[PDB]
Amino acid sequence: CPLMVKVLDAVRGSPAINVAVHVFRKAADDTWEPFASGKTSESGELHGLTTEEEFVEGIYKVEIDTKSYWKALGISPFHEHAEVVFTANDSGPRRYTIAALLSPYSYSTTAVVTN
Amino acid sequence: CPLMVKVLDAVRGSPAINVAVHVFRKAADDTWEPFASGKTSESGELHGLTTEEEFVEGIYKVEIDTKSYWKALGISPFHEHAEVVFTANDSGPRRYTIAALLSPYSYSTTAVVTN
Amino acid sequence: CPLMVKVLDAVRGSPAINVAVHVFRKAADDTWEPFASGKTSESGELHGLTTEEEFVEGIYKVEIDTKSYWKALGISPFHEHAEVVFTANDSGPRRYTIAALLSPYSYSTTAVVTN
Amino acid sequence: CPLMVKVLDAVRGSPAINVAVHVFRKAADDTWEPFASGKTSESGELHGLTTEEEFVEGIYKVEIDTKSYWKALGISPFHEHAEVVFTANDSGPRRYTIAALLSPYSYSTTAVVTN
Numbered sequence: 001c002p003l004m005v006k007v008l009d010a011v012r013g014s015p016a017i018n019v020a021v022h023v024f025r026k027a028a029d030d031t032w033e034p035f036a037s038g039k040t041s042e043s044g045e046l047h048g049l050t051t052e053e054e055f056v057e058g059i060y061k062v063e064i065d066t067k068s069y070w071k072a073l074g075i076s077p078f079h080e081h082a083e084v085v086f087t088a089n090d091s092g093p094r095r096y097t098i099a100a101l102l103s104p105y106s107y108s109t110t111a112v113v114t115n
Numbered sequence: 116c117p118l119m120v121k122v123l124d125a126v127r128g129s130p131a132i133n134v135a136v137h138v139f140r141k142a143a144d145d146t147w148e149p150f151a152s153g154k155t156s157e158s159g160e161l162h163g164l165t166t167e168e169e170f171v172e173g174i175y176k177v178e179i180d181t182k183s184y185w186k187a188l189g190i191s192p193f194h195e196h197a198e199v200v201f202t203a204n205d206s207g208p209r210r211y212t213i214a215a216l217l218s219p220y221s222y223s224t225t226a227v228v229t230n
Numbered sequence: 231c232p233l234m235v236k237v238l239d240a241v242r243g244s245p246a247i248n249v250a251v252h253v254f255r256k257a258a259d260d261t262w263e264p265f266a267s268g269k270t271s272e273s274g275e276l277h278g279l280t281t282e283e284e285f286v287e288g289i290y291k292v293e294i295d296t297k298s299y300w301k302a303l304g305i306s307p308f309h310e311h312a313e314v315v316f317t318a319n320d321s322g323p324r325r326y327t328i329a330a331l332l333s334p335y336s337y338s339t340t341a342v343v344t345n
Numbered sequence: 346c347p348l349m350v351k352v353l354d355a356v357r358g359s360p361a362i363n364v365a366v367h368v369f370r371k372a373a374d375d376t377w378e379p380f381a382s383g384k385t386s387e388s389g390e391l392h393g394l395t396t397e398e399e400f401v402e403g404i405y406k407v408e409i410d411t412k413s414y415w416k417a418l419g420i421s422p423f424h425e426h427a428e429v430v431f432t433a434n435d436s437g438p439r440r441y442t443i444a445a446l447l448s449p450y451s452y453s454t455t456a457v458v459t460n
């Protein structure tokens with residue numbers, strides 16, 4: 001599992017469950033090609049998006065569907081989603097954890113990169 | 116000024132100066148059209164992006180070029196840029212401030228919407 | 231004004247207004263002595279806390295009464311308050327801005343130190 | 346393990362390892378009594394601070410020694426430490442995760458509370 005996404009809810013103080021996540025990879029044509037997608041678990045975590053083989057060098061965009069999350073909770077948020085865009089594996093394979101903390105008018109994200 | 120962007124640097128404890136910022140508006144074909152742009156001032160602020168007349172309801176993307184900012188500082192960054200995507204909605208008089216706090220491997224953004 | 235505090239609300243997307251803020255300075259017996267206090271304005275800002283003459287080097291604690299703020303809004307909070315503890319150091323001319331972003335179960339704070 | 350502390354480094358994109366953490370509990374006299382302490386592991390996590398029996402109702406302060414962390418890395422940070430102050434177990438025993446993300450001039454903290 002070279003790519004994991006973890007999402008917490010800053011209003012409730014809990015994992016953000018059932019959050020849709022889409023990952024895209026920039027193609028030769030400079031367009032965003034679909035790469036992988038999933039939904040966070042009861043722990044707010046999304047594993048198994050990809051494999052070491054598939055997760056090649058490239059520029060990736062992780063889109064976390066925060067709007068759908070807030071609206072399912074009956075709340076009208078500010079952002080359409082939270083986006084994390086980064087070059088990956090440029091110096092060899094790494095394991096990436098993309099963590100995001102959500103509030104209706106704000107989000108914060110950080111990356112943990114390990115060898 | 117219905118739209119303002121403010122960027123701070125969490126490493127140096129200072130405004131993030133001379134940071135490039137691009138704003139796009141979503142078009143009917145779902146593509147992103149350039150809408151406005153600029154560079155943050157010595158106070159980390161970017162004013163004068165647009166006018167009330169131009170800033171109609173719609174979906175907007177604010178891209179903050181954090182990678183270049185960190186590069187100019189000799190610091191190794193994670194993200195290509197920071198992205199803030201939101202719908203602008205006409206609910207009485209509203210000024211939008213997009214604030215972003217930058218670290219090499221993390222960013223945090225909030226919106227302040229006031230009358 | 232060598233010391234300014236600014237507080238924003240991540241739930242409502244607005245300045246955090248009328249928030250009580252207490253500043254203490256560490257005394258020789260390691261106790262915290264009241265130093266300055268106030269309430270944030272309609273812009274979420276608290277100015278006029280101290281003067282250059284009074285604001286000498288030392289260790290300071292800024293306590294932001296977030297619990298009361300959330301209570302006044304009918305929202306259930308986690309923290310008793312938000313605390314920012316720092317040493318003030320005379321390195322040329324310096325203004326300190328303590329910024330805090332509030333959510334019910336989270337807070338984020340940064341310092342901006344400018345000349 | 347009703348109390349866990351997790352600390353990440355926003356400059357390096359990694360767990361913050363070997364960070365000292367002290368927990369205090371407010372006593373009848375309104376003073377801060379030492380409650381527990383430890384250091385984060387290679388994963389940035391601190392488990393085993395306390396037990397369900399010892400972790401009674403009360404107001405707790407978790408002090409994360411961010412200054413010592415940054416200085417050990419040869420960096421001069423702004424904060425003396427990061428403090429998280431909260432009432433715990435007021436409606437029965439809960440499990441608390443206190444997460445903190447560190448930059449030299451900024452920190453962000455959130456709580457996950459589960460039943």
Ligand SMILES: CC/C(=C(/CC)c1ccc(O)cc1)c1ccc(O)cc1
Nearest residue numbers: 214215216223224238329330331338
């Ligand atoms: C506290 C929100 C904030 C910032 C500065 C961008 C912020 C953003 C995200 C965080 O996690 C913490 C602070 C800010 C907003 C308006 C200002 O004039 C100054 C600062």
Ligand SMILES: CC/C(=C(/CC)c1ccc(O)cc1)c1ccc(O)cc1
Nearest residue numbers: 008099100101108353444445446453
């Ligand atoms: C401290 C980073 C973090 C979070 C929670 C997503 C975070 C992210 C950004 C911030 O500004 C503050 C906290 C987190 C990472 C791994 C976990 O298992 C739990 C929490």
